[PDB]
Design a protein around this ligand. Structure first.
Ligand SMILES: *[C@@H]1O[C@H](CO)[C@@H](O[C@@H]2O[C@H](CO)[C@@H](O[C@H]3O[C@H](CO)[C@@H](O)[C@H](O)[C@@H]3O)[C@H](O)[C@H]2NC(C)=O)[C@H](O)[C@H]1NC(C)=O
Ligand SMILES: *[C@@H]1O[C@H](CO)[C@@H](O[C@@H]2O[C@H](CO)[C@@H](O[C@H]3O[C@H](CO)[C@@H](O)[C@H](O)[C@@H]3O)[C@H](O)[C@H]2NC(C)=O)[C@H](O)[C@H]1NC(C)=O
Ligand SMILES: *[C@@H]1O[C@H](CO)[C@@H](O[C@@H]2O[C@H](CO)[C@@H](O[C@H]3O[C@H](CO)[C@@H](O)[C@H](O)[C@@H]3O)[C@H](O)[C@H]2NC(C)=O)[C@H](O)[C@H]1NC(C)=O
Ligand SMILES: *[C@@H]1O[C@H](CO[C@@H]2O[C@@H](C)[C@@H](O)[C@@H](O)[C@@H]2O)[C@@H](O[C@@H]2O[C@H](CO)[C@@H](O)[C@H](O)[C@H]2NC(C)=O)[C@H](O)[C@H]1NC(C)=O
Ligand SMILES: *[C@@H]1O[C@H](CO)[C@@H](O[C@@H]2O[C@H](CO)[C@@H](O)[C@H](O)[C@H]2NC(C)=O)[C@H](O)[C@H]1NC(C)=O
Ligand SMILES: *[C@@H]1O[C@H](CO)[C@@H](O[C@@H]2O[C@H](CO)[C@@H](O)[C@H](O)[C@H]2NC(C)=O)[C@H](O)[C@H]1NC(C)=O
Ligand SMILES: *[C@@H]1O[C@H](CO)[C@@H](O[C@@H]2O[C@H](CO)[C@@H](O)[C@H](O)[C@H]2NC(C)=O)[C@H](O)[C@H]1NC(C)=O
Ligand SMILES: *[C@@H]1O[C@H](CO)[C@@H](O)[C@H](O)[C@H]1NC(C)=O
Ligand SMILES: *[C@@H]1O[C@H](CO)[C@@H](O)[C@H](O)[C@H]1NC(C)=O
Ligand SMILES: *[C@@H]1O[C@H](CO)[C@@H](O)[C@H](O)[C@H]1NC(C)=O
Ligand SMILES: *[C@@H]1O[C@H](CO)[C@@H](O)[C@H](O)[C@H]1NC(C)=O
Lengths: 40, 240, 316, 46
């Protein structure tokens, strides 16, 4: 049942932002992320 | 923070150990070097319209002048095969030179320093980075602080306490819905709004969406407790 | 940011509908593939440049239905739903101000991101900015009120946050007037988008140049392949046709050299456009004059044919 | 004193000038001396 599907690519999740003239989100906690970057 | 760092370097080990994907950016350079020389070798096998690709099978069949009419074709086509390779290699050398000049800049700014440039040293807020050598390249392990568990709060730009508008020296004002605090912009850690945490300008009429709360003064109860010390000195002196 | 992808049938260009010219072309071997690998290498990269510039965010942020951006009026740069492509008002100026071969084997391949997908990524970056500040770069987007965002901004240029709030009406009215002057300016000046138009003009000039080289004799008795074949034998035809194959292959090796060199100019501009996307849009720069003149407060990206426009907002 | 910070004596700073500097602790203690002064005056009365 495997096949080559073809599709319009998704650019990312759709995500409305809860903006109001007196509302703010602030992080209670964090993560430390190590990421790799490669250059010739 | 140390455990999350030690965990994250562990995910770098496991990621690069598990699947052969990430280093494609170096492999595609090694491959275009090999493919270009391999192409340049194959071009020798072309005739350029001469009776052969094999120079000795021209020379060992023709004289000194019936051969020229063939050999000059091979010299011409072969020389154009070198000029094409050397052009591609120069144009390529610019791609690598550019990349190297960026790698030198990323070393200078993300390794020998700390960068305030957004996303330039990996996604997040840049803490620090570690260089690692790789065949014909460099790998940077960028270490970054990433905000993880936000809460919604209500906020206001200013507090009015005594007809005067107050503002944070650092941070932002927030309410848990019942009380008001000041906190640093990038990590929720609330503090009671004091005359030390805040600074003043103007009066309440101007700032759009200002709100009302007490502002604490840490000098006051220290003097008030000096007034209650003073009251017990005056009272005792009425006694004798 | 990018240029037109171009791909060529080296056989149809040199030798269209002649087996004879094909058999003489085999005498030169792999050169047609070497050219096609190079034009493919260019063409693939054009997607990469556009991906590095626009695809910097992996969530499509959307503006709230209500607008209380502190008196700032982004209606001129946000999406307009009334339209057949959901681009902004100022983007439709840009898509008009840039004004933009088949039978010779020359073909123009489509970009991976359609001009709709570029309108989506542009809107996501702009909606991220006006609702979420720097935080939509450095993690998940956190909301902040726009007058509070502008306070944190003023502190980024070393100005005290009360210098905003004591003047917020003026600061918005200046912003609203300035964006009006962007519209008015872009209608007025023809040189405005000149960089983008000069890129289109060069890629077009080179294809029309490459086509016109088919008319050249290269010292043959005719440019037309069958004028040579119809009146001559296998020997005298091979002499004559081998000049045309020489000349036309030299014409492709010229076009592809130019297009490779020109692709490096577009690459250098695309990486600069990706850096300005990260450091002027996803953040607030301390670099003097990097994100337009003044002290930098913020920037809004807008899409254009093969390019990007930044609206940089500065305290002067 | 809340706007400023203090280092050494005045010989070294080429182009330094003389003026008053307000300490906002002072009248907050001076009002607290007059109140105290009132306490003593009223305590002379009985
Ligand atoms: C908003 O944040 C406030 C500060 O954390 C919080 O108020 C605080 O609530 C605790 C109880 O949950 C109080 O704790 C004291 O309670 C009595 C006081 O007599 C003592 O017996 C206890 O041992 C303890 O010391 C705090 O006193 C109180 N702080 C203030 C300034 O009122 C609110 O509850 C938070 N609101 C919401 C909706 O979560
Ligand atoms: C924030 O705190 C302010 C100070 O308490 C408060 O201002 C006060 O608002 C009331 C209600 O409007 C006014 O009440 C008087 O208004 C007029 C005279 O000004 C009279 O006709 C009325 O009968 C009544 O006596 C106060 O005068 C006013 N005080 C000042 C100094 O302006 C704000 O309303 C508070 N705002 C919020 C949102 O909490
Ligand atoms: C700023 O304030 C300083 C402190 O008042 C003041 O310094 C004083 O200057 C005078 C005159 O130059 C000196 O007067 C004495 O000079 C010698 C001793 O050095 C004596 O022979 C004199 O009779 C006289 O008493 C003060 O000694 C000196 N004090 C100090 C601590 O420097 C500056 O001159 C003032 N400058 C301005 C621009 O107002
Ligand atoms: C943060 O808040 C937003 C919306 O504001 C809140 O709306 C109420 C529900 C209440 O919590 C108020 O105190 C706030 O003013 C949340 O957005 C909602 O998200 C859900 C999906 O989880 C969606 O179905 C609703 O339609 C959204 N409504 C609104 C008005 O935004 C948001 O989820 C909260 N985020 C976090 C992480 O707490
Ligand atoms: C911040 O997030 C980390 C995880 O990223 C939390 O650490 C975990 O805490 C739970 C218990 O609450 C433990 O079971 C895990 O073993 C912890 N993980 C690590 C790496 O130590 C941390 O508790 C969170 N802190 C706050 C204040 O929310
Ligand atoms: C934001 O500015 C725009 C103009 O750029 C305003 O839209 C105009 O509104 C008037 C009055 O309703 C209309 O006559 C125009 O036709 C509108 N122009 C466009 C292009 O839509 C808009 O009203 C302003 N927003 C606010 C909040 O004041
Ligand atoms: C700062 O400069 C602005 C203009 O750049 C001044 O705003 C104008 O003020 C005059 C009256 O003095 C009004 O007629 C204009 O309509 C105002 N323009 C705008 C866009 O609001 C402002 O007054 C100056 N402020 C100070 C304190 O000098
Ligand atoms: C915030 O918006 C509400 C409407 O939702 C309005 O009534 C209020 O006056 C606004 N306050 C500010 C500070 O803009
Ligand atoms: C008042 O203070 C004196 C010492 O100064 C002490 O001897 C006396 O017991 C005190 N009286 C009272 C009522 O506490
Ligand atoms: C400043 O310049 C003037 C001459 O215009 C000179 O007399 C004076 O001593 C100078 N002051 C300082 C502190 O250099
Ligand atoms: C003086 O002190 C007495 C208590 O000893 C007090 O009742 C009175 O209010 C005071 N008068 C003044 C003018 O402060």
């Amino acid at each position: 049942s495997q096949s080559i599907i073809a599709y319009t690519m998704s650019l990312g999740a759709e995500n409305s932002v809860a903006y109001s003239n007196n509302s703010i989100a602030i992080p209670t906690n964090f993560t430390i992320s190590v990421t790799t970057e490669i250059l010739p | 923070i140390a455990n999350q760092f030690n965990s994250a370097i562990g995910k770098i080990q496991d990621s690069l150990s598990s699947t052969a994907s990430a280093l494609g950016k170096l492999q595609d350079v090694v491959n275009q070097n090999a493919q270009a020389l391999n192409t340049l070798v194959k071009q020798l096998s072309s005739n350029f319209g001469a009776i052969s690709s094999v120079l000795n099978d021209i020379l060992s069949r023709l004289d000194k002048v019936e051969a020229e009419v063939q050999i000059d074709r091979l010299i011409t086509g072969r020389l154009q095969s070198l000029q094409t390779y050397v052009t591609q290699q120069l144009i390529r050398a610019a791609e690598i030179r550019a990349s190297a000049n960026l790698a030198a800049i990323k070393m200078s700014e993300c390794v020998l320093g700390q960068s305030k440039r957004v996303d330039f040293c990996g996604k997040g807020y840049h803490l620090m980075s570690f260089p690692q050598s790789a065949p014909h390249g460099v790998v940077f392990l960028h270490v970054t602080y990433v905000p993880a568990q936000e809460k919604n709060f209500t906020t206001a730009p200013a507090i009015c306490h005594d007809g005067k508008a107050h503002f944070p020296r650092e941070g932002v004002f927030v309410s848990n819905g019942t009380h008001w605090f000041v906190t640093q912009r990038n990590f929720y850690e609330p503090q009671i709004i004091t005359t030390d945490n805040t600074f003043v300008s103007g009066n309440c009429d101007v700032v759009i969406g200002i709100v009302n709360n007490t502002v604490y003064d840490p000098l006051q109860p220290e003097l008030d407790s000096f007034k209650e010390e003073l009251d017990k000195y005056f009272k005792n002196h009425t006694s004798p | 940011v990018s240029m037109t992808k171009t791909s060529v049938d080296c056989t149809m260009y040199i030798c269209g509908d002649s087996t004879e010219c094909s058999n003489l072309l085999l005498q030169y071997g792999s050169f047609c593939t070497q050219l096609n690998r190079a034009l493919t290498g260019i063409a693939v990269e054009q997607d990469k440049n556009t991906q590095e510039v626009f695809a910097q965010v992996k969530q499509i942020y959307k503006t709230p239905p209500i607008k209380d951006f502190g008196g700032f009026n982004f209606s001129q740069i946000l999406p307009d739903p009334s339209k057949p492509s959901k681009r902004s008002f100022i983007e439709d100026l840009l898509f008009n101000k840039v004004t933009l071969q088949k039978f010779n084997g020359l073909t123009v391949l489509p970009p991976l991101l359609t001009d709709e997908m570029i309108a989506q990524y542009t809107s996501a970056l702009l909606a991220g900015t006006i609702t979420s500040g720097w935080t939509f770069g450095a993690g998940a987007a956190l909301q902040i009120p726009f007058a509070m965002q502008m306070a944190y901004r003023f502190n980024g240029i070393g100005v005290t946050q009360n210098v905003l709030y004591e003047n917020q009406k003026l600061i918005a009215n200046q912003f609203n007037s300035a964006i009006g002057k962007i519209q008015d300016s872009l209608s007025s000046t023809a040189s405005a988008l000149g960089k983008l138009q000069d890129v289109v003009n060069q890629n077009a000039q080179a294809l029309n140049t490459l086509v016109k080289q088919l008319s050249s004799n290269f010292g043959a008795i005719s440019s037309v392949l069958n004028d040579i074949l119809s009146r001559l034998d296998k020997v005298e035809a091979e002499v004559q046709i081998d000049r045309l194959i020489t000349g036309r292959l030299q014409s492709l090796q010229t076009y592809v050299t130019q297009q490779l060199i020109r692709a490096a100019e577009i690459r250098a501009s695309a990486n600069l456009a990706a850096i300005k996307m990260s450091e002027c849009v996803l953040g607030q720069s301390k670099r003097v004059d990097f994100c337009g003149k003044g002290y930098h407060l913020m920037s809004f990206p807008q899409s254009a044919p093969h390019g990007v426009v930044f609206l940089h907002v500065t305290y002067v």
